[PDB]
Amino acid sequence: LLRILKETEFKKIKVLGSGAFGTVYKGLWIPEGEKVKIPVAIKELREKEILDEAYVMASVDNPHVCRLLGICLTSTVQLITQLMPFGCLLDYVREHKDNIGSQYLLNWCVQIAKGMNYLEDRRLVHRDLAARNVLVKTPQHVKITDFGLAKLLKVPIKWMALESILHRIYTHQSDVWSYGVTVWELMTFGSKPYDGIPASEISSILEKGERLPQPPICTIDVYMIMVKCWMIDADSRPKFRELIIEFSKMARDPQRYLVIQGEAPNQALLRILKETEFKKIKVLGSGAFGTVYKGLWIPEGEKVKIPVAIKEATSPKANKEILDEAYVMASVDNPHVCRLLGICLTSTVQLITQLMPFGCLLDYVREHKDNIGSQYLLNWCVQIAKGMNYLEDRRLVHRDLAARNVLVKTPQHVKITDFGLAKLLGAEEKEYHAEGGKVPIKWMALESILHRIYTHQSDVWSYGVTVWELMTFGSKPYDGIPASEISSILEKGERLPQPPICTIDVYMIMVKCWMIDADSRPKFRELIIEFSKMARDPQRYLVIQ
Ligand SMILES: COc1ccc(-c2ccco2)cc1Nc1ncnc2[nH]nc(-c3ccco3)c12
Numbered sequence: 001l002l003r004i005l006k007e008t009e010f011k012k013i014k015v016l017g018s019g020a021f022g023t024v025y026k027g028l029w030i031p032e033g034e035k036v037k038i039p040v041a042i043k044e045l046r047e048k049e050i051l052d053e054a055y056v057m058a059s060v061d062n063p064h065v066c067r068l069l070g071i072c073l074t075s076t077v078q079l080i081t082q083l084m085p086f087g088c089l090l091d092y093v094r095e096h097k098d099n100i101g102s103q104y105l106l107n108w109c110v111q112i113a114k115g116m117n118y119l120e121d122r123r124l125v126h127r128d129l130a131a132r133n134v135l136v137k138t139p140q141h142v143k144i145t146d147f148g149l150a151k152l153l154k155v156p157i158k159w160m161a162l163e164s165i166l167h168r169i170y171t172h173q174s175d176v177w178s179y180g181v182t183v184w185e186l187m188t189f190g191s192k193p194y195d196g197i198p199a200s201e202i203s204s205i206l207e208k209g210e211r212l213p214q215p216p217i218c219t220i221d222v223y224m225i226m227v228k229c230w231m232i233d234a235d236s237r238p239k240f241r242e243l244i245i246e247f248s249k250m251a252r253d254p255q256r257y258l259v260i261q262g263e264a265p266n267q268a269l270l271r272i273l274k275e276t277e278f279k280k281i282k283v284l285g286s287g288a289f290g291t292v293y294k295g296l297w298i299p300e301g302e303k304v305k306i307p308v309a310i311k312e313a314t315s316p317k318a319n320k321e322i323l324d325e326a327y328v329m330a331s332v333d334n335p336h337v338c339r340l341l342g343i344c345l346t347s348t349v350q351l352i353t354q355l356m357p358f359g360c361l362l363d364y365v366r367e368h369k370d371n372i373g374s375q376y377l378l379n380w381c382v383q384i385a386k387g388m389n390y391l392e393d394r395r396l397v398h399r400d401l402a403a404r405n406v407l408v409k410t411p412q413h414v415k416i417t418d419f420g421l422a423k424l425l426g427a428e429e430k431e432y433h434a435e436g437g438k439v440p441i442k443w444m445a446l447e448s449i450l451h452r453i454y455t456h457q458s459d460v461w462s463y464g465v466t467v468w469e470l471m472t473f474g475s476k477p478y479d480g481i482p483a484s485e486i487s488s489i490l491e492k493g494e495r496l497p498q499p500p501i502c503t504i505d506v507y508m509i510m511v512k513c514w515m516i517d518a519d520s521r522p523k524f525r526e527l528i529i530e531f532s533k534m535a536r537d538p539q540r541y542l543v544i545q
């Protein structure tokens with residue numbers, strides 16, 4: 001296992017690089033009694049724990065993690081490892097900055113995840129994961145070193161987790177943070193991390209919220225997963241095995257999941273904003289997942305203050321849900337759906353979106369109950385229908401279309417919000433089986449109130465309920481009926497009553513969304529068409545007193 005070596009066995013040739021404690025020398029080792037000259041690397045520390053440290057270093061065995069081959073107890077202890085002809089991965093991606101594909105980068109990320117998951121299985125803390133600490137033997141095979149501070153259980157601040165910078169706690173979660181920084185560096189082809197800011201302040205910027213920006217090569221899929229680790233809560237960071245299985249799922253089709261200049265990729269841009277860039281002025285109310293505040297946002301380089309709505313220790317499940325919500329909201333771009341300006345990666349993940357001055361539609365029709373015209377309501381219906389049609393094309397079942405989840409920006413243009421519960425469906429999947437949970441029971445369909453099945457037709461049912469709410473000028477649907485008793489009274493075929501302003505055609509459109517047979521319910525395109533025909537004469541189809 002351990003080879004105690006004499007200085008006479010090896011002779012150095014050329015210095016290859018410099019490390020934190022000492023420089024690595026390329027040299028040829030002559031084993032005792034042997035003539036084969038093995039090319040090895042020798043590290044000399046600029047200086048008996050090191051005996052046991054070499055023991056534990058040699059104990060490792062995995063093609064993605066390096067093993068110390070021998071030590072030499074001369075005037076200063078030296079470490080001998082097998083030489084890697086292709087150098088460090090950081091310099092390699094720097095040299096091939098224009099000649100590296102997505103497949104190679106994703107494969108390298110897979111290899112790093114596999115190797116440090118092995119290190120976790122061996123129960124060793126690297127404490128120094130970085131792009132420079134990654135070495136490549138053959139371009140399709142990279143494998144980690146620099147275990148010189150491993151213990152049985154300045155400094156590279158730019159690659160260190162916030163708990164390591166401040167509280168000096170080095171666990172596998174900090175290693176996951178360092179892995180995320182390494183993936184960032186590999187994506188940027190070796191660009192500096194937090195370039196321009198010296199190490200004395202990288203703790204404050206991390207605490208403030210600003211993180212490593214999205215590289216142009218990166219999609220929102222890989223990058224938001226490439227963050228996943230920069231929250232203060234350590235447990236919220238993904239474990240290594242999940243990282244390997246997910247990146248291997250990524251490696252199946254790498255071309256789609258990254259963009260290289262020279263199955264539609266998701267080029268959505270997500271930007272990280274300082275907590276100091278914006279201030280919470282007005283409380284818009286309490287959302288389903290928390291409280292939403294309204295305030296002016298000051299962006300870098302532009303003095304104009306854009307009023308934005310901000311939404312907010314969150315549980316790891318809550319963190320994953322807010323991760324999915326941020327992905328879904330940033331991935332959409334439609335005139336009638338709310339878009340994500342950016343996120344703040346503080347201890348409580350904060351969501352930054354454009355503000356609508358008049359508030360939500362339900363409150364707007366409640367306060368102005370005596371003044372909405374027929375054209376306003378009809379155009380509102382067509383706009384909500386267009387928004388969820390665009391959502392349907394994006395395969396994001398909203399699952400929460402309520403009058404509270406649609407906002408009034410301008411009287412003639414409304415937007416949909418509250419994408420927290422929206423789950424993206426696969427290209428082959430047609431239904432999603434939610435495992436229950438606390439939900440607005442009084443709005444969902446029978447197939448979701450009893451069978452836990454959410455589909456596009458569930459969104460159609462929610463659309464019908466929202467139309468009924470809009471035509472009722474803000475009256476509460478199903479007044480006095482419990483949450484559990486909704487299914488009992490609805491399985492027969494009884495529905496909400498007729499608003500005073502709805503003609504027979506309005507109700508005939510409304511009912512069809514509420515049919516027991518989901519497949520027989522109208523699709524959103526046909527509803528869009530029907531309400532487009534209704535828009536030719538708003539005064540005919542409604543009666544206003
Ligand atoms: C950061 O690099 C290291 C850190 C630690 C060691 C190590 C571990 C035990 C003995 O040496 C060894 C290396 N480096 C290496 N080990 C083998 N072959 C190598 N070819 N090129 C390098 C290289 C260039 C710049 C940094 O490393 C290198």
Ligand SMILES: COc1ccc(-c2ccco2)cc1Nc1ncnc2[nH]nc(-c3ccco3)c12
Pocket residue numbers: 284285286287292294309310311329351352353354355356357358359360404405407417418419
């Ligand atoms: C249910 O409503 C939301 C749910 C989530 C967000 C949000 C903020 C960041 C990402 O999504 C934003 C909103 N709503 C909003 N978005 C823009 N301007 C708004 N003015 N007033 C509200 C408001 C009051 C009660 C519920 O919303 C609102």
